[PDB]
């Protein structure tokens, strides 16, 4: 179902695409996994702990 | 971890690649061959080393 929803999005089944280093501009060998992850910021913030 | 995967991916060989079988004076032009995209990072090659 995930790959099938990837087809509808024009994006590969692998979930991996080509990525290029923003430094040298050259391509990265092998495809890398890119996507959207839900990420939380816990409150351990450094200006508290320090 | 990251570092050892680096040296592992660096030092390794596949069956066929760019510059397979060719010969080079030393590591200098080996790296020079790789960085220019002419030769693959892992390819079976005879080189003169000291």
């Amino acid at each position: 179902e995930i790959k099938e929803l990837l087809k509808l999005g024009d994006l590969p089944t692998s979930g991996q695409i080509r990525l290029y280093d923003g430094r040298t501009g050259e391509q990265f060998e092998r495809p890398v996994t890119v996507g959207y992850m839900y990420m939380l910021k816990l409150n351990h913030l450094v200006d508290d702990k320090m | 971890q990251d570092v050892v995967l680096g040296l592992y991916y660096m030092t390794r060989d596949c069956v066929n690649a760019k510059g397979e079988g060719m010969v080079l004076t030393g590591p200098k032009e080996a790296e020079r061959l790789y960085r220019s995209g002419l030769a693959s990072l892992h390819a079976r090659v005879k080189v003169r080393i000291t």
Partner: protein, 302 residues
């Protein structure tokens, strides 16, 4: 040793365009292209709104009666307002509106160098019949990202507490991508093309951006103890009355060093200094171990 130059510039939208470069030698499309992408994303002129003074607002954490948007939300909306100026480095605009309905970016008073790229842009909504908002939107020009937090060091009396500082979003560029395809010019062995497809807010022309980018890129190639500190403090550090300070400044006395040289005679001869002011000055100077008619001989060193 053929040097590249530009060709058709295809504008598909107010937002973004694809600029193209024809005469590119072996592998140079990448070398030029990525380096161009870098400068394009990083360093570019921008005009993003900085300071905003609103109607009844002391801080960005309040809500104004008559608008469903929180003040912080309104600041965040303003930060996303794209404007372009010509002769002015910093202009201040004035926004005014009332009655029920959305307040867009076209509701501001139009100035000489003001160009609104998104008139439909929403600053904030209006929920009540009689409810009105006025604000001064202080828009200045700069490069890179300048947060609101680092903006305060210089300080120097930002006292108008009604003025809320906002983070600087200075940069026309949103997205830049460069693709090299083999470009066949009539006669030549093999050459490459450079298709730079960029994304903007409309506040910068493609030719202009692509120009300055390589301008800077090439531009980088251009290389390949006696006396008292208290004497140099401004007179404001003496914390005199407004009258005395203004009088002294009017008599070319801007620092403590200038004041301690003057005598009572000379000060009383000024058009605006009475005995009360002189008493005050002598008092505040004596309170810090200073006086009038003090000689320091050597005014000034450097």
């Amino acid at each position: 040793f053929l040097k590249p130059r530009l060709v058709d510039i295809e504008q598909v939208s107010s937002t973004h365009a694809k600029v193209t470069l024809e005469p590119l030698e072996r592998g140079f499309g990448h070398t030029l292209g990525n380096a161009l992408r870098r400068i394009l994303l990083s360093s570019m002129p921008g005009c993003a709104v900085t300071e905003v003074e609103i109607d009844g607002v002391l801080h960005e954490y309040s809500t104004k009666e008559g608008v469903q948007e929180d003040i912080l939300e309104i600041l965040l909306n303003l930060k996303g307002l794209a404007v372009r100026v010509q002769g002015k480095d910093e202009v201040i605009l004035t926004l005014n509106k009332s009655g029920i309905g959305p307040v867009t970016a076209a509701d501001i008073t139009h100035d000489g160098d003001v160009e609104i790229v998104k008139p439909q842009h929403v600053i904030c909504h209006l929920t009540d019949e009689n409810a009105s908002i006025s604000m001064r939107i202080k828009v200045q020009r700069g490069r890179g990202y300048v947060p609101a937090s680092t903006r305060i060091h210089s300080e120097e009396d930002e006292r108008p507490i009604g003025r809320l500082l906002v983070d600087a979003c200075y940069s026309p560029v949103e997205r830049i991508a460069y693709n090299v395809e083999a470009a066949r010019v009539e006669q030549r062995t093999d050459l490459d093309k450079l298709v730079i497809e960029m994304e903007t807010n409309g506040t910068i022309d493609p030719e202009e951006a692509i120009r300055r980018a390589a301008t800077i890129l090439a531009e980088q190639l251009e290389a390949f103890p006696e006396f008292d500190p208290i004497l140099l403090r401004p007179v404001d550090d003496l914390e005199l009355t407004v009258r005395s300070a203004n009088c002294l400044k009017a008599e070319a006395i801007h620092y403590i060093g200038d004041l301690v040289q003057r005598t009572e005679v000379e000060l009383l001869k000024t058009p605006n200094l009475g005995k009360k002011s002189l008493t005050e000055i002598k008092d505040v100077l004596a309170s810090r171990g200073l006086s009038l008619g003090m000689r320091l001989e050597n005014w000034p060193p450097a």
